[PDB]
Amino acid sequence: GFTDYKVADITLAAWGRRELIIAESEMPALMGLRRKYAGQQPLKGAKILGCIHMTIQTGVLIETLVALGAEVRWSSCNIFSTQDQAAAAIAAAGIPVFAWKGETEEEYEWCIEQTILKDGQPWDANMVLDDGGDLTEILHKKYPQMLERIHGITEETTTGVHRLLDMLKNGTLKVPAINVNDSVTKSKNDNKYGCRHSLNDAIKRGTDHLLSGKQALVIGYGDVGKGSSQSLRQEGMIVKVAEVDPICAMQACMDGFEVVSPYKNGINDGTEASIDAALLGKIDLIVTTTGNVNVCDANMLKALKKRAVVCNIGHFDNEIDTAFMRKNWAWEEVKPQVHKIHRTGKDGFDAHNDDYLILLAEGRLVNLGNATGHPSRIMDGSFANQVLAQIHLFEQKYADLPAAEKAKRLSVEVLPKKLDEEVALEMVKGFGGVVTQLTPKQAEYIGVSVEGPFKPDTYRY
Amino acid sequence: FTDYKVADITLAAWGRRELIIAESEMPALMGLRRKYAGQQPLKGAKILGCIHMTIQTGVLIETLVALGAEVRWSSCNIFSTQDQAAAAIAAAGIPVFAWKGETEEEYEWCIEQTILKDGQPWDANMVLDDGGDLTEILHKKYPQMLERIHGITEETTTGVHRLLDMLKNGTLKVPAINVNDSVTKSKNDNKYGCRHSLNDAIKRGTDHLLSGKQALVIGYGDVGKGSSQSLRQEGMIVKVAEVDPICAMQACMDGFEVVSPYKNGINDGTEASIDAALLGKIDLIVTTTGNVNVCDANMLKALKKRAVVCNIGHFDNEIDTAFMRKNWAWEEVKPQVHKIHRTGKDGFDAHNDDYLILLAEGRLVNLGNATGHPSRIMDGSFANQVLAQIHLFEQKYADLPAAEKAKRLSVEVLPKKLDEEVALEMVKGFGGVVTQLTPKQAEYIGVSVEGPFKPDTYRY
Amino acid sequence: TPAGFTDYKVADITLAAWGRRELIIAESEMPALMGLRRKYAGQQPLKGAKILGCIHMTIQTGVLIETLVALGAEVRWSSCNIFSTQDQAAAAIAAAGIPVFAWKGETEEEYEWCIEQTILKDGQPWDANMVLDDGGDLTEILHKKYPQMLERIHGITEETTTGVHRLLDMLKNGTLKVPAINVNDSVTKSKNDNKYGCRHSLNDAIKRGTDHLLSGKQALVIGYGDVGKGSSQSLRQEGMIVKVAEVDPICAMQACMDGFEVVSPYKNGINDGTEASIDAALLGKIDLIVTTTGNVNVCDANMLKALKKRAVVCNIGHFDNEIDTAFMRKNWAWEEVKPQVHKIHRTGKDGFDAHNDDYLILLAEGRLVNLGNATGHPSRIMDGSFANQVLAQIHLFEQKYADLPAAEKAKRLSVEVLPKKLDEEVALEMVKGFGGVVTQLTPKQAEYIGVSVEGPFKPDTYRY
Amino acid sequence: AGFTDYKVADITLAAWGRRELIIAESEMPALMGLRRKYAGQQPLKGAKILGCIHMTIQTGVLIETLVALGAEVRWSSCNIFSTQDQAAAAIAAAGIPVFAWKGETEEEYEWCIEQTILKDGQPWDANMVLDDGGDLTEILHKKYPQMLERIHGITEETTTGVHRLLDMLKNGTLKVPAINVNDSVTKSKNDNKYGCRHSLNDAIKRGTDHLLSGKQALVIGYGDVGKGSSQSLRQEGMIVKVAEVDPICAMQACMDGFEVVSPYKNGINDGTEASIDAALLGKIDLIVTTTGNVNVCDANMLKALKKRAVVCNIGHFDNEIDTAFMRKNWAWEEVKPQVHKIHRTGKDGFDAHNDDYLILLAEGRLVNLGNATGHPSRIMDGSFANQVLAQIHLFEQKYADLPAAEKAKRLSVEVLPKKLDEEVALEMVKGFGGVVTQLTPKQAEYIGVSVEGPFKPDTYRY
Numbered sequence A: 001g002f003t004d005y006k007v008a009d010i011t012l013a014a015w016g017r018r019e020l021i022i023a024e025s026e027m028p029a030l031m032g033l034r035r036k037y038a039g040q041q042p043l044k045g046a047k048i049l050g051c052i053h054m055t056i057q058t059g060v061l062i063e064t065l066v067a068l069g070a071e072v073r074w075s076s077c078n079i080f081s082t083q084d085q086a087a088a089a090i091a092a093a094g095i096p097v098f099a100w101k102g103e104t105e106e107e108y109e110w111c112i113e114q115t116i117l118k119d120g121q122p123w124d125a126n127m128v129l130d131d132g133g134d135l136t137e138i139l140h141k142k143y144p145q146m147l148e149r150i151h152g153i154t155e156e157t158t159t160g161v162h163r164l165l166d167m168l169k170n171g172t173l174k175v176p177a178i179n180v181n182d183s184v185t186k187s188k189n190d191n192k193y194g195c196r197h198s199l200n201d202a203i204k205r206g207t208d209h210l211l212s213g214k215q216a217l218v219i220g221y222g223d224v225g226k227g228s229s230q231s232l233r234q235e236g237m238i239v240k241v242a243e244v245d246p247i248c249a250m251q252a253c254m255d256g257f258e259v260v261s262p263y264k265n266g267i268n269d270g271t272e273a274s275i276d277a278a279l280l281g282k283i284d285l286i287v288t289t290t291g292n293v294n295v296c297d298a299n300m301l302k303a304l305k306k307r308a309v310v311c312n313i314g315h316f317d318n319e320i321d322t323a324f325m326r327k328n329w330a331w332e333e334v335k336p337q338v339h340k341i342h343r344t345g346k347d348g349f350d351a352h353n354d355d356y357l358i359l360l361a362e363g364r365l366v367n368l369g370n371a372t373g374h375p376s377r378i379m380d381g382s383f384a385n386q387v388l389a390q391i392h393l394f395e396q397k398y399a400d401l402p403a404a405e406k407a408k409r410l411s412v413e414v415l416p417k418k419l420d421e422e423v424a425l426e427m428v429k430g431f432g433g434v435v436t437q438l439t440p441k442q443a444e445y446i447g448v449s450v451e452g453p454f455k456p457d458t459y460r461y
Numbered sequence B: 001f002t003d004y005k006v007a008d009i010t011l012a013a014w015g016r017r018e019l020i021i022a023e024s025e026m027p028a029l030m031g032l033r034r035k036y037a038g039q040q041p042l043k044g045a046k047i048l049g050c051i052h053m054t055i056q057t058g059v060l061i062e063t064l065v066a067l068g069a070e071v072r073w074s075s076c077n078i079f080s081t082q083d084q085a086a087a088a089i090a091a092a093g094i095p096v097f098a099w100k101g102e103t104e105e106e107y108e109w110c111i112e113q114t115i116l117k118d119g120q121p122w123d124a125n126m127v128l129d130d131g132g133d134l135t136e137i138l139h140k141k142y143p144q145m146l147e148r149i150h151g152i153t154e155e156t157t158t159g160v161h162r163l164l165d166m167l168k169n170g171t172l173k174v175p176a177i178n179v180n181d182s183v184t185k186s187k188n189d190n191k192y193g194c195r196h197s198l199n200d201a202i203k204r205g206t207d208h209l210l211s212g213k214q215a216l217v218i219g220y221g222d223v224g225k226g227s228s229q230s231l232r233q234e235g236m237i238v239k240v241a242e243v244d245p246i247c248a249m250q251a252c253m254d255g256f257e258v259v260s261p262y263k264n265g266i267n268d269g270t271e272a273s274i275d276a277a278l279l280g281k282i283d284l285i286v287t288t289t290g291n292v293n294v295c296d297a298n299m300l301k302a303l304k305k306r307a308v309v310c311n312i313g314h315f316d317n318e319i320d321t322a323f324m325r326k327n328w329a330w331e332e333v334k335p336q337v338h339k340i341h342r343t344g345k346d347g348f349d350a351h352n353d354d355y356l357i358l359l360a361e362g363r364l365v366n367l368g369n370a371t372g373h374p375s376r377i378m379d380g381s382f383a384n385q386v387l388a389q390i391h392l393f394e395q396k397y398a399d400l401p402a403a404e405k406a407k408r409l410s411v412e413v414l415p416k417k418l419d420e421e422v423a424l425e426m427v428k429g430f431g432g433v434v435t436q437l438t439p440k441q442a443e444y445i446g447v448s449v450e451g452p453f454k455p456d457t458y459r460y
Numbered sequence C: 001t002p003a004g005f006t007d008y009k010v011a012d013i014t015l016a017a018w019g020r021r022e023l024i025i026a027e028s029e030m031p032a033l034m035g036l037r038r039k040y041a042g043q044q045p046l047k048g049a050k051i052l053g054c055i056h057m058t059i060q061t062g063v064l065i066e067t068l069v070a071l072g073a074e075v076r077w078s079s080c081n082i083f084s085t086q087d088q089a090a091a092a093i094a095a096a097g098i099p100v101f102a103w104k105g106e107t108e109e110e111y112e113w114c115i116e117q118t119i120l121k122d123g124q125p126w127d128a129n130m131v132l133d134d135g136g137d138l139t140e141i142l143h144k145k146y147p148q149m150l151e152r153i154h155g156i157t158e159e160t161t162t163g164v165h166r167l168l169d170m171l172k173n174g175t176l177k178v179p180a181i182n183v184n185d186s187v188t189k190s191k192n193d194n195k196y197g198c199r200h201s202l203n204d205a206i207k208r209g210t211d212h213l214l215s216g217k218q219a220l221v222i223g224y225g226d227v228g229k230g231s232s233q234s235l236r237q238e239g240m241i242v243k244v245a246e247v248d249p250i251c252a253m254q255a256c257m258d259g260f261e262v263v264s265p266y267k268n269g270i271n272d273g274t275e276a277s278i279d280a281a282l283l284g285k286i287d288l289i290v291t292t293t294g295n296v297n298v299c300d301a302n303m304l305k306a307l308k309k310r311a312v313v314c315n316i317g318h319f320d321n322e323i324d325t326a327f328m329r330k331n332w333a334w335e336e337v338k339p340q341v342h343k344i345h346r347t348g349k350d351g352f353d354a355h356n357d358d359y360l361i362l363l364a365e366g367r368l369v370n371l372g373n374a375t376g377h378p379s380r381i382m383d384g385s386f387a388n389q390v391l392a393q394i395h396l397f398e399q400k401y402a403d404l405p406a407a408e409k410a411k412r413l414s415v416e417v418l419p420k421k422l423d424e425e426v427a428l429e430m431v432k433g434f435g436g437v438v439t440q441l442t443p444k445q446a447e448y449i450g451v452s453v454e455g456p457f458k459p460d461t462y463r464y
Numbered sequence D: 001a002g003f004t005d006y007k008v009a010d011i012t013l014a015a016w017g018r019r020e021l022i023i024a025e026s027e028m029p030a031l032m033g034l035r036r037k038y039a040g041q042q043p044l045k046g047a048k049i050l051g052c053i054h055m056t057i058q059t060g061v062l063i064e065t066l067v068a069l070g071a072e073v074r075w076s077s078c079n080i081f082s083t084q085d086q087a088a089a090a091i092a093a094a095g096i097p098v099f100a101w102k103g104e105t106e107e108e109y110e111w112c113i114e115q116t117i118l119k120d121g122q123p124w125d126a127n128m129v130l131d132d133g134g135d136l137t138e139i140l141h142k143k144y145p146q147m148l149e150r151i152h153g154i155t156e157e158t159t160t161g162v163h164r165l166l167d168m169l170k171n172g173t174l175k176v177p178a179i180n181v182n183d184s185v186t187k188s189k190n191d192n193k194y195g196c197r198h199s200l201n202d203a204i205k206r207g208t209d210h211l212l213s214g215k216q217a218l219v220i221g222y223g224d225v226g227k228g229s230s231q232s233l234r235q236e237g238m239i240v241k242v243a244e245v246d247p248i249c250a251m252q253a254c255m256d257g258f259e260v261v262s263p264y265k266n267g268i269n270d271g272t273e274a275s276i277d278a279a280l281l282g283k284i285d286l287i288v289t290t291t292g293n294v295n296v297c298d299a300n301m302l303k304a305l306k307k308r309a310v311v312c313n314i315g316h317f318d319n320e321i322d323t324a325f326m327r328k329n330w331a332w333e334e335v336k337p338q339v340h341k342i343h344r345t346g347k348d349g350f351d352a353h354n355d356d357y358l359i360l361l362a363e364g365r366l367v368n369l370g371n372a373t374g375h376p377s378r379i380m381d382g383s384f385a386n387q388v389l390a391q392i393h394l395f396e397q398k399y400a401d402l403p404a405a406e407k408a409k410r411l412s413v414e415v416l417p418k419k420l421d422e423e424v425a426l427e428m429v430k431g432f433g434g435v436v437t438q439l440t441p442k443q444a445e446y447i448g449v450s451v452e453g454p455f456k457p458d459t460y461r462y
C-alpha cells in the first residue's frame, strides 16, 4: 500500500524496470560502486533530498544510493525532463518520487515541496543532491531549520555551482557543498560529450529536420557549447560560434568554426539596428549553451531566417527571450515540446503561414525535453561522482560539528583527483580499453606514483 | 659582424621574405610590437635564448629586439633549425648559433657561444628556454652568471617539469614563468600545433599514404590529442595508449580504441608481455609522452615490417633508439629518414623487406622532418613569451636584497587577463568577432564585462 | 473530408491534425517536390491516372501522395513495410479522403491484406493504370495474382535497389508485363537518399531504440554500397570505431581510403558452415552490427552465436532476411523492451532470467531499422527521391504503354532511368533549398568542356 | 656503361631515387603483383612505348614494371614542375631514356617530348603511347602521323586527356584506339579524389607553412578532384565553400556539409567587375581550382580576393587561373621556387613590405605535384596497375597490323572491364590488410553474380 509518490502512470513501471536493467549494464563505474560498498552500507542513516531530472539514468543513481543504505525523497529539476517510465519504476520500488514529464511551474514547485515535507512536516533530511540549485535555494529561503541538520549538498551542474559560490561569497551558504560538475569525469564527459550525443538527437526527434548542409549558430563555446557545436558539425551542419570569452573563441577557430557575433562589431546595445541581419537571416538553427540570460534576444528572434529552429541546452530557459514571444507572437503546438511561433501577430495564425520559428521544449533544456538527455554510459561518470560526493559529505557529519569547526569546513570543494581517475578507469574498462601501467623507472622519470594521481591539480586535460 | 655561426649566410634574403610573411600570420606578437614599441620595456635586457631557430622564432627574436632587448640565440634541438631563418637573424646583426643537422657536440658548443661573448661570460640578465637545456647548463656550469639574471621564461611541458624539480629541491636560483601553461600556449601550440605538423612531417619524410593504415599513438595529453587528430583526420585507424585513465577516457569518447603495447597493460620487461598481435598490425607509432622508453626494444622487435617510428615529445629517449643503434643496421634514405634493418647489425641487403623507418633519428619529428608548428599557432606561444620576458625583466629580481629574493623565488603563470588578450588578437586574426557582455549579463554570470571570464580553475 | 469516407484502414484517425501539421512543415522542406506541384498543377499531367502505391506511409510519402493528387491522379496506398508507417501521416492522408491501408506494427497477414485493399475496390479489381512501388512487393502480387490488371497498366515506377533488381530479373526472364522506370538510380535518388538518408537516420534509430552511447564502441557494418557508405558515416561521425565487411573489392577499397578497417566475420573470408570458421575474437568485441547489403543471411546464426554479449543487431537493407532472425526465434527467448526493441536471450528457448547478461538487442525485429525505430530519411532528402517519382509517373502515364499495339509494346518493354537533364533539374531545386548558388558557365567555358550552358554537364557514364 | 640517351637535372641523385623506388615498390602491391604475374610471359616483349607523365618516384615504378614485362620506353614528364629529379636520375641510371627535370621552361618541355619521339634524329620505332593530359598525343597527331600508322594504341591517364581524345574521335581525327585509364573506379575514385585529399594540403603546407584550421577556403569545382580537394582542406579545419556549375555535384557538396557559393552575384558571370561578389571573395584566404575548365579564377576575382590569399590550381592545366592577367599587370616576387607573391600595387617594382599581395603556388600549374610530390605511392598503385593492364591489352590487340576494314571496327575509346578494375582493387585492399568476404554460391545467385565477380553492373556508380 505504498502511496508516498506522484507520477504520471504507475503502470509504466515494468517498462521502466526493463530499461533500468539495461542501463545498469551501461553504467560500470556506478554499478561498480554499488557492488564495492553494498556490504559496508556507507550511507546507512543518510536521508537525501534529491532534485535532478527523473530519467532512467537518475533511476540507477537513486537505486545505488538506496543500495548503499540511504533513504531518499526525489523530484525532477526540470518540468520536461522526467522519463515517466523511470519515475514509475522508482515509485513501484517504494521510493518517494514526485515527477512527471510536462509539469506546470506550480506542479514543479509542489513536487520539490513533497520531498521536503513528509506527512505535512519537515522530513528528517540530512543530505541534499541538487542539479541547478532550485532545491538548495528553497531550503535556504524557506527551511533554514532543516539546513541545521543537513551535512552537505552535492551539486550536479555549472549553473548550480555558480549559485552556491554566490551564497558562499554573501555568507548565506548554510552547509558545505561538493561541486560534482568539475570532476573531469563530469565536466569534460557529461557537459561536452553528453551534449554531443543528445543535442542532434533531440532536434531530430522534435523536427526530423535534415541537418547536413544547413547553417547553425551556437551561442557559447564552454563545455556544453563545444559538445553542441560538434553534435551539429558531425551531422554536416555549417556551424558558426558566438562567444564573449576570447580564449573559448580561439578554441572554436582552431576547431574549424567561424566565430561570429549576432551584433555588429559584437556590441549588444539593445537596438534592432545592432543585429547583423544578413547573418541571422541565413541561420537555420540557433542553440544557446551559455548559462547566461537573454543570449537569444527579441531582436535576434525578429531577424532569424523564416522557419529557423530555436532551442536551448543550457540549464534555464531564460537564455532565449521566450517571454517576448509569448507576449507578441502566436504559438501553434505541433506536438508536445514542439511549437511553431508565428511572427505575423498575436491574435491567431494562418495554418499555412510561412513566417514562423520552431521552438523546442518551450526553451527548456532541449536534450532532456525533446529526447532522453545524456546516455547511460556518459551519466555513469557524473553519477559515480555523485555517489562518492554523497559518501564523503555524509561521513564528514558537518551538522554535528561545533560552531568553530563548521566555520573551518564551510566551503565548496571538488572531489580529489585520485577519485576522478578511478571513475575514469572504470569508464575506460567499460569500453574495453586497456590502460598501461607505468614501470617504476617511468614513474620516477615523470615524478608520479605508479597508481596516480598522474597530473597536478592544475592540469586542464 | 662575425658573431654568429649558421649553415649558409646567403640564405638570409630568403629567410627575410619568409619572416615578412610570418609577421602577417602572427597578429598577437606583432600587436605587442606596436603596443610596446614606444615604451621599450626591454631596454637594457640581455636575453640568452634557446629555442628551435625557425622562422617563427625569428619573429619572436625580432620582437624582443624591437622592444629594446639584446639577445644571443641558439636552437634547442639539433634538427629543428630552419637555416634560412638563422641566416636572416645573423644578417640582421643578431648573434645566433644554429643550423639544421648539428651533432650533439655542436649543439652544446652553440649554447656555449650564447653564454660566452669574446671568451668571457656575457653580461646576460634574462633567459628564454625551451626544454631546460640552457637553464640546466647555467645552473650546473655557470652558476655565478645566475647572480645577474632576473628570470627564466620556459616554453614547454618537459622544461617546466625540470623547473619544478629544481624548485622542489631548492636548487632553482632565479624566478621563472611557466609559459607552457597559458591556455593560448598549452591548448593551442601543444595540441593544434601537432595536429598541423605531425602528418606534415610524416608526409615530407616518407610521402606515405596514411588513409586506411593503422597507427598507435602513445600518450593522450595535449600533444597526443593533437597528434591523434593529425592522423585520424587523414583517415588513419588510430589506437591510443595511456597510463592516465582520465586522458584514456577522453580518447575513448573522442572515438579511439585505447590499447596497451603490453598484455593487460603490464610491462614486466619480458618479450612475453608484448602484445605481438597488436604490434604486428601497426603501420605507424608516434610517441607523445615526455616519458622514457615508451616505445621500447621489445615493442620495436614486434612491430609490423616497414612500420614508421617517430617521436614528437621533447626528447629522443621516448623510443629506445640506442637499442637500434646497437643491434640493427641503419640505411639513410635522405636526411632525417633512416631504414633500420632488423636483419642484423653489420651491413644490410638493399632489398631487405624487414626494416622500420625512423624519422629524425627519434628527435622531435614535426621540427625534424618539416617546419614545426605554423606561424599563426606559434603566435600565441610567443606573445606569451614576450609578456613573460617583460614582466620578469621589470621585476628586477637580481637587484633585490637577499631576503626579498626568498619571497620572489617562484614559478608563476601569466594572469588570465593577459591570456585572454593574446587569445583576442588570435581570434581577430581569423576575422572572428568576440561578443561583448551587457552589464546585466556580466552581473548575471558574476564576471566583469572586461573579464577575466573564467576562474583560474577553469579547464577549457 | 469527403462525406461518409470509410475507404481506408489506419491505426488512429484522431492523429490526423498532427499529421497535417507535420505535412505543412514537410512541404517547406521539399522544394523540388513542391516546385513540381506548383509547376504542373494547372497542366494536370496525371489527370486520369489511377495509381496503386506501395511505399512506407511516412510524412514524406504523404507529401508525395498529395503531389500526385494535386497533379490530377487518383491513388490507393499501402506501406511497403510492417513497421515503417507513421500513424499520424496515414491518418492525415485518410482524413483527406485518400484510400490508405497502413499502420505501424502490422502483422505479415495484415501487410498482404493492406496491399490487396489497394488492388481491390468494393471487392473487385480497381481500374488502376499506374504502379508506384518500393521493393517490388506490389509489383510481385500483381504479376502473380492479378495478371489481368497489368493489361491496363502503363508502367511501374520503382523506388529502391532491391525492387530494381527484381524488375531486372523479371525483364531478363521474360515475365515483366509493363515498362518501368528505375527511380533508384537517378543520382538525386541513389547518391542522396540511399547514402545521406542512412547517414541521418541510422544513428537516429539506434538512439531512439536503445539510447546507447555510440562514441568509443565497436561497430561492424556489413556492406559498403550506398547504404553501407551512409551507415558507416552515421556511426563513425558519432565516434564509433567502425569496421566494414564487403564482398566487392572496389567497395572495400573505398572503405579503406575512407578510414575504415575492412574485415570479414569469417576467417580468411571463407564461410565453411562451421562455428570454427567464425572469427570469434573479432565478433566478441563488436558492440553493434548493421547489415546493409540487400543480400541474404549476411549476419548468420554462427555470427549471432559469437557476438559480444549485449551487442545491438539491426538491418537497414530492404528485407529482414539479411539477419537470421528465424534462427533466433527458434532457439532463443525474446523479451520485448518496448515496441520494435527486443532482448534476445541466448540462454535458451523456454523463458529467460530477467537479469540474464547474455542477450543481444534486436531492433525492429530485423526490419529496416531507420523506418522501424525512427522516421526514416528526412523530408529534405526524400524531396530528391520523390521528385524523381513524380517525373517518372508523369512520363510513363503520358507514354500510355497499355494502349499501344502489341508490336509497339515489345519495343517499349524496358527498365529505364530518367534523363540526366531531369536529374540535374531536381538537384538544382535541392541546392536552392539550402540557399546554395550554382554558377552559370560562360559560353566560352561551355564550349571549352563541350557542354551546353544549360546542361547536361556530364556524360551518362559519369559516376559522381 | 656508355649510356647518354637521357637528360636529367643531376644523375648523381640516382642512388637516392633508387632507395625511394625500393620503398615505393613496397607501397605498390598491385603494380608489383603485375610484375610477378607477367614476368615469365613477357606480354610487352616488342612493345616500344612513348610515355609522357609526371616523372615522379611513382612513375618510376610504373616504368620499371613496363620494362620488366618486356617493353622498351622513352619518357618525358607531362608538366614542367612535376618531375622529382631523383626519380628521373634513377631511371636514367638504369639505362632508360628519360628527358625530365623539375623547373623546365616551356621550350624545354616541348624539347623533352620531342626527344622521346625522335631517336638519333629520326622517328623512334614506337608502337604504343602512354599519356597524361594529351600533349604527347596531340604532337603525334599534328606532327608525326606516319608514326601513328604503326602505333597500336594510347593509354590515357587523366580526365583532361580523355576529353581531348573524345574530341578527336568526334571529329574523326583520332588515328589509333585508346583506353581511358582515368575512368576505372580504382583510378578516378581513388587517384582523382583520395590522391588530392592527401596531396593538396601537403603542397599548401610545403609552399607556405600556413595554418589552415580556422581559415576560409573557396574550392572551384566538386568533381572527383574538387571532392578530394575540399576534404583535404575541411579535414584540416578550414571553413570550405564550394562553387559548381553542375547542380548534381553541388547537391553532393551541400549534403557533404559545405556551403555552395558562386564568385558571381546570382552565379551570373557577365565579365563586369560589378558581377563579382566582392564581400564573399574579400573573406577568402585560399582559392583552389579543380575544374579542368578555363578561367574559373578570373582577373576580376583575383582583384577582389582578400589581401594575402593563397591562389592555386590542382586541375591539369594552368589556364584555370588568369595568370596571364597577373603577369601583365602585377609585380611578381619569388619567395622560393614555385612560391610567388603577386603584388597588386602595380607591375613595375614592389614594396618589400607591401601588404596587398596574393600568394600564387607553382605559377598556377598542378599544385600537388608542383609544390609537393603529387599523390602517394599506395594511391598511384591503382592508377598505374590500370595503365599496365591497358598497355597489355592494346599491344596484344595489335591494331596497327589490322586491315583497314578491321581498324574501322576497333577505333574507339574504351575502359578496362570491371573484372580487371576489381582485381586491381583487391590488391589495394590486401595492401591495407583488408579481408574481403567470399560469397556463398547461394548469396551469389541471390544477387545475380559469380562468386569471383564482377559484383556490379557496368552502370553502377560506387
Ligand SMILES: NC(=O)c1ccc[n+]([C@@H]2O[C@H](COP(=O)([O-])OP(=O)(O)OC[C@H]3O[C@@H](n4cnc5c(N)ncnc54)[C@H](O)[C@@H]3O)[C@@H](O)[C@H]2O)c1
Residues within 6 Å of the ligand: A157, A158, A159, A160, A190, A191, A194, A195, A219, A220, A221, A222, A223, A224, A225, A242, A243, A244, A245, A248, A289, A290, A291, A292, A295, A313, A314, A315, A316, A365, A366, A367, A368, A373, A374, B435, B437, B441, B453
Ligand atoms: N543540457 C545538459 O544536459 C547540460 C549539461 C551540462 C551543463 N548544462 C548547462 O549548460 C550551461 C553551460 O554549462 P557549461 O559547463 O558549458 O558552462 P561554461 O561556463 O563552461 O560555458 C558557458 C560559455 O558561455 C559563454 N557565454 C556566456 N555568455 C555569452 C554570451 N552572451 N554570448 C556568447 N557566449 C557567452 C561563456 O564565455 C562560456 O564560455 C549551464 O547552464 C549548465 O548548467 C546543461
Ligand SMILES: NC(=O)c1ccc[n+]([C@@H]2O[C@H](COP(=O)([O-])OP(=O)(O)OC[C@H]3O[C@@H](n4cnc5c(N)ncnc54)[C@H](O)[C@@H]3O)[C@@H](O)[C@H]2O)c1
Residues within 6 Å of the ligand: A436, A438, A442, A454, B156, B157, B158, B159, B189, B190, B193, B194, B218, B219, B220, B221, B222, B223, B224, B241, B242, B243, B244, B247, B288, B289, B290, B291, B294, B312, B313, B314, B315, B364, B365, B366, B367, B372, B373
Ligand atoms: N614537438 C612539439 O612541437 C611539442 C609541442 C609541445 C610539447 N612538446 C613535448 O611533447 C611532450 C608531451 O607534452 P604534453 O604537453 O602533451 O604533456 P602532457 O603531460 O599533457 O601529456 C603527456 C601524456 O603522456 C602520458 N604518458 C606518460 N607516460 C606514458 C606511457 N608510458 N604510456 C602512455 N602514455 C604515457 C601521460 O599520462 C600524459 O597524458 C613533452 O615532452 C613536451 O615538452 C612537443
Ligand SMILES: NC(=O)c1ccc[n+]([C@@H]2O[C@H](COP(=O)([O-])OP(=O)(O)OC[C@H]3O[C@@H](n4cnc5c(N)ncnc54)[C@H](O)[C@@H]3O)[C@@H](O)[C@H]2O)c1
Residues within 6 Å of the ligand: C160, C161, C162, C163, C193, C194, C197, C198, C222, C223, C224, C225, C226, C227, C228, C245, C246, C247, C248, C251, C292, C293, C294, C295, C298, C316, C317, C318, C319, C368, C369, C370, C371, C376, C377, D437, D439, D443, D455
Ligand atoms: N533503409 C533505407 O532507408 C534504405 C534506403 C535505400 C536502400 N535501401 C536498401 O538497402 C539495400 C542496399 O542498397 P544499396 O543501394 O546500398 O545497394 P548496393 O548494391 O549499392 O550495396 C549493397 C552492397 O552489399 C555488398 N554485399 C553483398 N553481399 C555481401 C556480403 N555477403 N557481405 C558483405 N557485403 C556484401 C555488395 O558488394 C554491395 O556493395 C537494398 O536492399 C536497398 O533496397 C534501404
Ligand SMILES: NC(=O)c1ccc[n+]([C@@H]2O[C@H](COP(=O)([O-])OP(=O)(O)OC[C@H]3O[C@@H](n4cnc5c(N)ncnc54)[C@H](O)[C@@H]3O)[C@@H](O)[C@H]2O)c1
Residues within 6 Å of the ligand: C439, C441, C445, C457, D158, D159, D160, D161, D191, D192, D195, D196, D220, D221, D222, D223, D224, D225, D226, D243, D244, D245, D246, D249, D290, D291, D292, D293, D296, D314, D315, D316, D317, D366, D367, D368, D369, D374, D375
Ligand atoms: N592534380 C592531380 O593530381 C589531378 C588528379 C586527377 C585529375 N586531375 C585534373 O583535374 C581536373 C578535374 O578532374 P576531375 O576528374 O575532377 O573532373 P570532373 O569532370 O570530375 O570535375 C570537374 C568539375 O568542375 C566543374 N566545373 C566546370 N566548370 C566550372 C566552373 N566554371 N565553376 C565551377 N565548377 C566548374 C564541373 O561541373 C565538374 O564537376 C582535370 O583537369 C583532371 O585532368 C588532376
Ligand SMILES: CC(=O)Nc1cccc(CO)c1
Residues within 6 Å of the ligand: D029, D030, D031, D032, D033, D034, D037, D385, D420, D423, D424, D427
Ligand atoms: C588479368 C590480370 O592480370 N588482373 C590483375 C589486376 C591487378 C593485379 C594483378 C596481380 O597483382 C592481376
Ligand SMILES: Nc1ncnc2[nH]cnc12
Residues within 6 Å of the ligand: B051, B052, B053, B054, B055, B056, B057, B193, B367, B371, B372, B373, B374, B378
Ligand atoms: N615552428 C616552431 N618554432 C619554434 N618553436 C616551435 N615549437 C614547435 N614548433 C615550433
Ligand SMILES: [K+]
Residues within 6 Å of the ligand: A055, A057, A372, A373, A374, A375, A376, C211
Ligand atoms: K538517456
Ligand SMILES: [K+]
Residues within 6 Å of the ligand: A208, C058, C060, C375, C376, C377, C378, C379
Ligand atoms: K522522416
Ligand SMILES: [K+]
Residues within 6 Å of the ligand: B207, D056, D058, D373, D374, D375, D376, D377
Ligand atoms: K608522391
